[PDB]
Amino acid sequence: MKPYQCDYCGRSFSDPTSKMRHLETHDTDK
Numbered sequence: 001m002k003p004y005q006c007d008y009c010g011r012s013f014s015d016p017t018s019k020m021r022h023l024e025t026h027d028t029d030k
């Protein structure tokens with residue numbers, strides 16, 4: 001078991017897919 005957590009969020013995603021979208025769409029400054 002290894003939680004796919006976000007380095008900035010501290011939130012553990014149990015799925016690499018949504019942890020992926022969440023990490024790439026984190027780039028929503030504009």
Ligand SMILES: [Zn+2]
Binds near residue numbers: 006007009022026
């Ligand atoms: Zn995040």
